[PDB]
Amino acid sequence: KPSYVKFEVPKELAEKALQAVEIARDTGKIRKGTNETTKAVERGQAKLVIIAEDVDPEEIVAHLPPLCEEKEIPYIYVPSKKELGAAAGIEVAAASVAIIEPGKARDLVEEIAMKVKELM
Amino acid sequence: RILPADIKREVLIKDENAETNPDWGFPPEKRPIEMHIQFGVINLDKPPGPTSHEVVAWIKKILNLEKAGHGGTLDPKVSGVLPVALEKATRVVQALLPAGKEYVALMHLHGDVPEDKIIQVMKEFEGEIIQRLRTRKVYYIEVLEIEGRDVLFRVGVEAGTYIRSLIHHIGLALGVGAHMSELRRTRSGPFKEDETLITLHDLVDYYYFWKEDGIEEYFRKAIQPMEKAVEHLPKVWIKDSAVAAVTHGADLAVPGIAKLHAGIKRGDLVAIMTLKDELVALGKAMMTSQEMLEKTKGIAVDVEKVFMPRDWYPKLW
Amino acid sequence: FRIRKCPKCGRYTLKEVCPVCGEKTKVAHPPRFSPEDPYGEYRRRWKREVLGI
RNA sequence: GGGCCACGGAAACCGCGCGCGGUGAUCAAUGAGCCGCGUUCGCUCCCGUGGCCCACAA
RNA sequence: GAGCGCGGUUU
Ligand SMILES: [Zn+2]
Numbered sequence: 001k002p003s004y005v006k007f008e009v010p011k012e013l014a015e016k017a018l019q020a021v022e023i024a025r026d027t028g029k030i031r032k033g034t035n036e037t038t039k040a041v042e043r044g045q046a047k048l049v050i051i052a053e054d055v056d057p058e059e060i061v062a063h064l065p066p067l068c069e070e071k072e073i074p075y076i077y078v079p080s081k082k083e084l085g086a087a088a089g090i091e092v093a094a095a096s097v098a099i100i101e102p103g104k105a106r107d108l109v110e111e112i113a114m115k116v117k118e119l120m
Numbered sequence: 121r122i123l124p125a126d127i128k129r130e131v132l133i134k135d136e137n138a139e140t141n142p143d144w145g146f147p148p149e150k151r152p153i154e155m156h157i158q159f160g161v162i163n164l165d166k167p168p169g170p171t172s173h174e175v176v177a178w179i180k181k182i183l184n185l186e187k188a189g190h191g192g193t194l195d196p197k198v199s200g201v202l203p204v205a206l207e208k209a210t211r212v213v214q215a216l217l218p219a220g221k222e223y224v225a226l227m228h229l230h231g232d233v234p235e236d237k238i239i240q241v242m243k244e245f246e247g248e249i250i251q252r253l254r255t256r257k258v259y260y261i262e263v264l265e266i267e268g269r270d271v272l273f274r275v276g277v278e279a280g281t282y283i284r285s286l287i288h289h290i291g292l293a294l295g296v297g298a299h300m301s302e303l304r305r306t307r308s309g310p311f312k313e314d315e316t317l318i319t320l321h322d323l324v325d326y327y328y329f330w331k332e333d334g335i336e337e338y339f340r341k342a343i344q345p346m347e348k349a350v351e352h353l354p355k356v357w358i359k360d361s362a363v364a365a366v367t368h369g370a371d372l373a374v375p376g377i378a379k380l381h382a383g384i385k386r387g388d389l390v391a392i393m394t395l396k397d398e399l400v401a402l403g404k405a406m407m408t409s410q411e412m413l414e415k416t417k418g419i420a421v422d423v424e425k426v427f428m429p430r431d432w433y434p435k436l437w
Numbered sequence: 438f439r440i441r442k443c444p445k446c447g448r449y450t451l452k453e454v455c456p457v458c459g460e461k462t463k464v465a466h467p468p469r470f471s472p473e474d475p476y477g478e479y480r481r482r483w484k485r486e487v488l489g490i
Numbered sequence: 491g492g493g494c495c496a497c498g499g500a501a502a503c504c505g506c507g508c509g510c511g512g513u514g515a516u517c518a519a520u521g522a523g524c525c526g527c528g529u530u531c532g533c534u535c536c537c538g539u540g541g542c543c544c545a546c547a548a
Numbered sequence: 549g550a551g552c553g554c555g556g557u558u559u
Contacts, residue, residue, distance in 0.1 A: 003487050033519030038476070039512095057468040059321055060520055063479040070479070081520095091517050167467045168438075169508060171554080173530035178472045178509095180531080189532035193553060196507065199466045205532090214533055217553085224449045224465070226440055265451055272440065272451055302440050304465055313447070320470035325481050335490060358547085365545040369494030373546035401494090417546055426494055430542075437545040438520085468520080472529090473510055 004062040005053055007119045009077045016112055017050055017076050020105045021087045021097055028103020032088040034061055037096040041067055046098040048074050048109055052081030055095045064096060074113040123220040123259055123276050125309055125352040130382040132413055138359050138378035140395035145363070145432045147396045148345035153336055157183075158207045159427070160343035162323065163316045166194050166202040175320075176204055182324055191216040192279060192308055200305035201317065209346035211425055215389070215402060219309030219352055220259065222276045226303070227287050229269040231296025238271060239263050241293050251285040258286070274306070310351035318342050346427065347399050350391040356380035356412070356421065357393045358400065361436040366392065366400055367428050368435075372421040377412055384409040390421060394433075401426045440465040 009017075024030045031040045040046040041064070049068050055061045068075045078084050085094035102109045146155060166175055172193045180188050189210045191203040200223075205213050229238075242261050249256055259276035266272075275283065284300050291298025306313050318326075326339040358366065362376030378395060388405040403421040412420045441462035442448065443455035453462050 004483060031514090031519095033514080033521060035519075035521065036514065037519090055520080056463050057520080059468040059480060062483045063476040066479040066482040067476070085519075088519085090515090090519070092519065092521095094519055096519090165467045167469050169469050171508075171530050173532080173554090174508075176531040177529085178470075182472070187532085191533095193531090196554095210531095211533070217533075224440060264449055267451055270439070270451065272449065274449070302438060304440060319467040321468065321480065324470075324474065324477070325484055328477075328481060329485075329490070333490070338488070361547040362545085363547090365543090365547065367494080368543045368545065369492090370543080370545045370547090371493075376547045419546080423494075430495085435543090435545080437547065464520095469509090471509060475510080 001053060002055065002058050004051075004055075004058050004065060005077055006065055007077070007116075009119070013112070013115055014076070014078045016108060017078050018083065018087045020048065020102075020108050020112060021050055021084070021099060023105035023108070024099045024101070024103050025087070025089050026103075028099065028105065029101035030088060031098045031100055032085070032090065032094045034064070034096045037098045038064065038067065040098040040100060041071055041073055044071060044073075045100050046073050047102060048076065048099045048112065050084060050097045050099070051075055051077055052084045052093075052095055053077050053079050054081050061095050074116055076112060076116050121260060121262070121274075121276070123222070123307075125219050129354060131379055132382050132409060133379050134413055135359065135378045138395060141360055142396075144360060144434065145394055145396055145398050145428075147398060148347055151345075153330070153340055156340060156343055156345070157185075159209045159346045160206045161209055161212065161346055161349050162204040162206065162342065163311045163314075163318060163344060163348075164190075164202045164204050164323070165317050165319045166199055167320060168197050168199045171196050172202055175202065178320075179204060179323075183327055189213050191311075192221060192305075194305055195303070198303045198305060201308045201311050201313065202305070203308055203311045203349065205346070205349065206343070208427065208429075209349070212346050212349040212399075212402075212427070214425070215350055215353060215391070216309045216311075218279055218389075220276060220278055221281075221305055221309075222274065222307035223283055224264075224272070224274050224304050224306055225283055225287060226301050227271040227273065227290065227298050228301045229271065229294065229296055229298050230291065232269070233294050233296060235266045238266060238294065242271075242273065242290060244293070245286065245290065249281075249286065249289070251282055251289070254280070256281040270301075276307075310348055316341075316344060347393075347397060350399055350402075353391040353402075354381040354384045354388060354405075354409075355391045355393050356384075357395055360395065360433060363394055363400055363428070363433040364430065364435045365437050366423055367426050367430045367433070369423065369426065371419045371423050372403065374407075374412055374415045374418050374420050377420060380409055380412055382409045384412070392421060392423070394428075398428060398432075400428045438464055438466050 257278040287300040330339040357379040402425040445460040446458040
């Protein structure tokens, strides 16, 4: 798997992540696509960055992990960018997605940040 | 899968006794990084988007270069092999321009045609063609995959052939029409898709690795010696005592040849090398390979473009 | 973009597995580059760690 | 006289295309539409200015 | 100046 993927994420962990982006869409606030996602991180608006593992070319997102660490923002890997797009409410893929305001997936996201804390 | 640049040449020996002095000149891998660049060529993998001209302009500003030129222009949407000569090597693009190219194209049919019809009709474009007016040669066409209206194929052509035009004419021959939806140049003369083919990101990142970290490795590999740009030309190798004369505008007389390729005919474009395989100059042959070999006097090559600096080799005359 | 290439064999294909070698294919074209290179600083950071610098 | 090398042989605006910034879309989020700013290398003949040589390779 | 390699108007 790609070099920009810096740890292994268990099915369950990455499954919660899609639920988070799911629920944050219709009750909270998200941004979708690597450009909006990267603006969100550099403006310090992003709570959790979700990055898809199947991005080709890597360079599209390879800058996101180092960026997030600089800014001290949690990020996680979901397996597929097709389903990451579907979860953000679009019929097209999404290489990356930021959750800006958690909404009802408020606790769900506190947890996800915990599990990734360890994975580092 | 064969272009005329691929033909193998025989080396004929004129002076078996000729040796080279290792204190003179700089073979490609004995060059300080700064000199490597001055006489370097980039095998760039152009990205889709920018024109070839813009791409080169970025390279100049980002590497802080005075001069640079590309070989065969690639269209904005096309990717692949774009050779970029730097600095004092810039004029070698003139050696690259006449040489043949190879592409991988994606053709889209405007109607349905059987896979066997397609393959058979494309087969017929091998050989000469003429496009809108002039004549151009197609060395080979290979259909890799057909997926309904999408036809993926490789093509080898003479310099000048427009792939758009060609795909259009194939569309007419099939009747339903066709357009090119994707193009990538995979070879341009001595430049090919190999480990030397470097993208812009890799290129500018390697530059910083060297300029801002003291790491020289990665950027050195990014630059090829200008000699690379001449791998496909017939060569004549000269004795050390003629090298300085020739960088000084002297024509190359027969007594200074140590070794040459066979096949050279008068008028031919030839690369003049030293016995260390540094490139001295480009020239036009005044003699055939056999004439240069049997004679003991006369001008064998008119020297026209001099690349090597005058002080690499001593003034032995 | 539809043109893909086997990293192992060098084969050009539209499929996600090399029909020759069986390897997974990657898109043939290089990523777009910007003269401004907004995130170069961070891509390089990633890249140093990849090349063991 | 000849050869080689260097510099020169125009400049400002518009459109297209592309890049960035902004916004961020009823199958282009690997970025649509709209807005603003950017943006196209050189080569070969000849002519001028200047520099280095005149070297059948010892 | 004349060619080979982005379309339209200005002295
Ligand atoms: Zn194979």
